Design a protein around this ligand. Structure first.
Ligand SMILES: *[C@@H]1O[C@H](CO)[C@@H](O)[C@H](O)[C@H]1NC(C)=O
Ligand SMILES: *[C@@H]1O[C@H](CO)[C@@H](O)[C@H](O)[C@H]1NC(C)=O
Ligand SMILES: *[C@@H]1O[C@H](CO)[C@@H](O)[C@H](O)[C@H]1NC(C)=O
Ligand SMILES: *[C@@H]1O[C@H](CO)[C@@H](O)[C@H](O)[C@H]1NC(C)=O
Ligand SMILES: *[C@@H]1O[C@H](CO)[C@@H](O)[C@H](O)[C@H]1NC(C)=O
Ligand SMILES: *[C@@H]1O[C@H](CO)[C@@H](O)[C@H](O)[C@H]1NC(C)=O
Lengths: 596, 198
């Protein structure tokens, strides 16, 4: 009869016939990941094509129901999600060209091999040939050669492709009632129709700038300290008044600063909190690691893992005969089937990764009650954030002492807290200016603020202004320096890390306040607190049914993203860095003072 | 579940203790009678309804419940006397390719009456528009297949449900429980109960 009942029956029909197809596609993807064979690749391709065709047909049927005659929030949200054209609105020739461009960029990035001229008999790929050199070398010219050669080859190949890509994506986005592709990406956080909890696409950029302005003093002090330490490591290259050289950040692109912990350690004499040896001595298997993680989740009050999880997951490397992807990934296959694919080793990093992926599994399990098309996070930030909070909680010394991995008589003095906080800042705080600068540059490129002939002149100017990183040598317009990163080349949003980082500490403050922790934020563990788990599970159960603003109100009590928990987390480190930067000069100059 | 089997059990002795003492059943919820006194009481007829549902849908097989199964597939009366027995059947009813032999009625204009079987295969009309016999837009086929895989979760795994319905009618009750004989003792003054004569 009415439009709302028709939409509800159609949505039921969609969820029922879409859950099984999604399960088949996900199972084919799992079979490919755990067993890399040509038939598995063919099965994955066939399942993906069937899934995409079914989604296209259901979207085509879905568009015939007008949005304005539906009052139920969940039904309206599912209809809005289904009725998106995506690439369908574009012409078949341009759609095929866009798909071909994306695939060829994927092949060029994945199979890109670059080596030194005059010695071409063998070459090194990016992983792990170039990663180890970027992360461990202390030689200026070798790192400079690797960075410049890889950007030269990849940028020169990808620059016309990127020029076509921006135009095609802008055409698709403007055809889809968006201002640009940046507006399309910013539409994920858009909330419409809820009184008081509405969020606009335009508000996201303003909020990011407002938070980053408060991020800037801490980043400036951290940059000054890292600059001083790198000056100690490399005597003549780094200038006291200028920016840091691009190839010296410890990674290929500057995404993380975690590879500079050895060079920039405050107290080298003091020991670390490494617990790898304790697990090796007591013969801790990967199964024990996952059982301890499960014990942590039942300690906080969340449901324990299913029998299917233990039976069907691959938590150890299979062997030489069977090939598998080594990247840790949590799979929500559908129909209550949750698995983790990780090549787990006896390391602290794998243990934290196991907690992070099991957090992903818990998040996936929580919204199983919801309809199929709403079985996701409220935004892209929350899904990563719920894993990151478990990663934060598991790494604390209190958690290690509780589970027996650390000695009960370990002395927790201020120096270990300072060096640990500095390492966490290098991993977490350091990615924020790079992420903000890259997303703002991409948004300006999509918007048309920056013409194609002026992409790099602005970009380096942005990098000096925001990231405090200077180019080693000037680059002309033949280079395509941003596209050397995995996320940008394969059509992925990059603001998820920034939102995840702010949400991570907001959630951490909320759970620690719930758990009645009375000390520093970084010394807080969320184990043994039922109320904290209940508060988290209230947001977790909703999934995508409710706006992200309402979920944030449910957890932290705020209607907007906030920057204060990050500053509160690193406040001892902030005071220590302010004390240590009395002699040095905080801030940088955008000029070519170190090298150009 | 749309075409649930009904078997009428009459003119025999029903031993309920074998079912009760089994550990193979996940749900043994009895409504209107208790399992302890089932082995003593006698009933006129026993209705055994058998079907397969999902793990999450076992709760809907009860009086007063609401759902797809209760409204459109199998409806139980409020004044129901009997037992609902359900057990996991992942071992037999799930195959690697997917077992799609089990179907459920997803849409019907009105709710089912208690103990009603609907085997109609007419296209459901969700809109004013005439369906015209073809399954197109706003017109859907009511019977939807089920997907059963051996790696599914416990809430999606197939569960076999047998519902026993006990009714007493004015006709003589013939489905009686197994009375247990004792050993015979002779030459002593004892209280004898022979075939109801005490
Ligand atoms: C992986 O694929 C090979 C190829 O035939 C097959 O023999 C083997 O059983 C597979 N192993 C698993 C765990 O799927
Ligand atoms: C919206 O629909 C869902 C399922 O279709 C239903 O459970 C919920 O009560 C509806 N909300 C309102 C306000 O009617
Ligand atoms: C999708 O595209 C079609 C035509 O290309 C258009 O009629 C329809 O309005 C679009 N959907 C939305 C939600 O705008
Ligand atoms: C998970 O929790 C349930 C209920 O608390 C319990 O019965 C079950 O044994 C647990 N599973 C494992 C593997 O510990
Ligand atoms: C740690 O505490 C001791 C004792 O108060 C103090 O002397 C030392 O300067 C502190 N170190 C740092 C890095 O705060
Ligand atoms: C949390 O509970 C476990 C289980 O009893 C216990 O072993 C652990 O010590 C508790 N945590 C703390 C900090 O006491």
């Amino acid at each position: 009869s009415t439009i709302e009942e028709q939409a509800k029956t159609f949505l039921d029909k969609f969820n029922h016939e879409a859950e099984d197809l999604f399960y088949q596609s996900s199972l084919a993807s799992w079979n490919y990941n755990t067993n890399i064979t040509e038939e598995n690749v063919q099965n994955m391709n066939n399942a993906g094509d069937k899934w995409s065709a079914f989604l296209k047909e259901q979207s085509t049927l879905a568009q015939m129901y007008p949005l304005q005659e539906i009052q139920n929030l969940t039904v309206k949200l599912q209809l809005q999600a289904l009725q998106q054209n995506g690439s369908s609105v574009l012409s078949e020739d341009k759609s095929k060209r866009l798909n071909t461009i994306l695939n060829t960029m994927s092949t060029i990035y994945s199979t890109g091999k670059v080596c030194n001229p005059d010695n071409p008999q063998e070459c090194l790929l990016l992983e792990p040939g170039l990663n180890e050199i970027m992360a461990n070398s202390l030689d200026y010219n070798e790192r400079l050669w690797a960075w410049e050669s890889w950007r030269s080859e990849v940028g020169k190949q990808l620059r016309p492709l990127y020029e076509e890509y921006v135009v095609l994506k802008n055409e698709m986005a403007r055809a889809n009632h968006y201002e640009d592709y940046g507006d399309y990406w910013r539409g994920d956080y858009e909330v419409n129709g809820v009184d008081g909890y509405d969020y606009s696409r335009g508000q996201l950029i303003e909020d990011v700038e407002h938070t980053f302005e408060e991020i800037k003093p801490l980043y400036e002090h951290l940059h000054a300290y890292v600059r001083a330490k790198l000056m100690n490591a490399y005597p003549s290259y780094i200038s006291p008044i200028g920016c840091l050289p691009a190839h010296l950040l410890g990674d290929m692109w500057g995404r993380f600063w975690t590879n500079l912990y050895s060079l920039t350690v405050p107290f080298g004499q003091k020991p670390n909190i490494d617990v790898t040896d304790a697990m090796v001595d007591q013969a801790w298997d990967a199964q024990r690691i996952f059982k301890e993680a499960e014990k942590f989740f039942v300690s906080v009050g969340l449901p324990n893992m299913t029998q299917g999880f233990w039976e069907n997951s691959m938590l150890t490397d299979p062997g030489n005969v069977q090939k598998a992807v080594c990247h840790p990934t949590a799979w929500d296959l559908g129909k209550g089937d949750f698995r983790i694919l990780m090549c787990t080793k006896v390391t602290m990093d794998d243990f934290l990764t196991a907690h992070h992926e099991m957090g992903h599994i818990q998040y996936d399990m929580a919204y199983a009650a919801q309809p199929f098309l709403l079985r996701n996070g409220a935004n892209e930030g929350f899904h990563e954030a719920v894993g990151e909070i478990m990663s934060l909680s598991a790494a604390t010394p209190k958690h290690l002492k509780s589970i027996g991995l650390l000695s009960p008589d370990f002395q927790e003095d201020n120096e270990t807290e300072i060096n640990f906080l500095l390492k966490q800042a290098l991993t977490i705080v350091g990615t924020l200016p790079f992420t903000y600068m890259l997303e703002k540059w991409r948004w300006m490129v999509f918007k048309g603020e920056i013409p194609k002939d002026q992409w790099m002149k602005k970009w380096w100017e942005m990098k000096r202004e925001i990231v405090g990183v200077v180019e080693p040598v000037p680059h002309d317009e033949t280079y395509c320096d941003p596209a050397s990163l995995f996320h940008v080349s394969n059509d992925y949003s990059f603001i998820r890390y920034y939102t995840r980082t702010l949400y991570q500490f907001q959630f951490q403050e909320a759970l620690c306040q719930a758990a009645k922790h009375e000390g520093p934020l970084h010394k807080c563990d969320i184990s043994n607190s039922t109320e904290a788990g209940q508060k988290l599970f209230n947001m977790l159960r909703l999934g995508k049914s409710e706006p992200w603003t309402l979920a944030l109100e449910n957890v932290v009590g705020a209607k907007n993203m906030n920057v204060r928990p990050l500053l509160n987390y690193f406040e001892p480190l902030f005071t220590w860095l302010k004390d240590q930067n009395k002699n040095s000069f905080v801030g940088w100059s955008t000029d070519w003072s170190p090298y150009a | 579940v749309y075409a649930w089997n009904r078997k009428r059990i009459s003119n025999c002795v029903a031993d309920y203790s074998v079912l009760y003492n089994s550990a193979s059943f996940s749900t043994f919820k009895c409504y209107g009678v208790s399992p302890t006194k089932l082995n003593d009481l006698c009933f006129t007829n026993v209705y055994a309804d058998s079907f397969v549902i999902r793990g999450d849908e076992v709760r809907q097989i009860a009086p007063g419940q609401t759902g797809k199964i209760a409204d459109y597939n199998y409806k139980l009366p409020d004044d129901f006397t009997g037992c609902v027995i359900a057990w996991n059947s992942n071992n037999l009813d799930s195959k690697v390719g997917g077992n799609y032999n089990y179907r459920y009625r997803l849409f019907r204009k009105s709710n089912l009456k208690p103990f009603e079987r609907d085997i109609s295969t007419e296209i459901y009309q969700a809109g004013s528009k005439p369906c015209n016999g073809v399954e197109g837009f706003n017109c859907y086929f009511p019977l939807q297949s089920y997907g059963f895989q051996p790696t599914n979760g416990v809430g999606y795994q197939p569960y076999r449900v047998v519902v026993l319905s006990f009714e007493l009618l004015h006709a003589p009750a013939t489905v009686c429980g197994p009375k247990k004989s004792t050993n015979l003792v002779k030459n002593k003054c004892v209280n004898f109960n022979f075939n109801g004569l005490t």
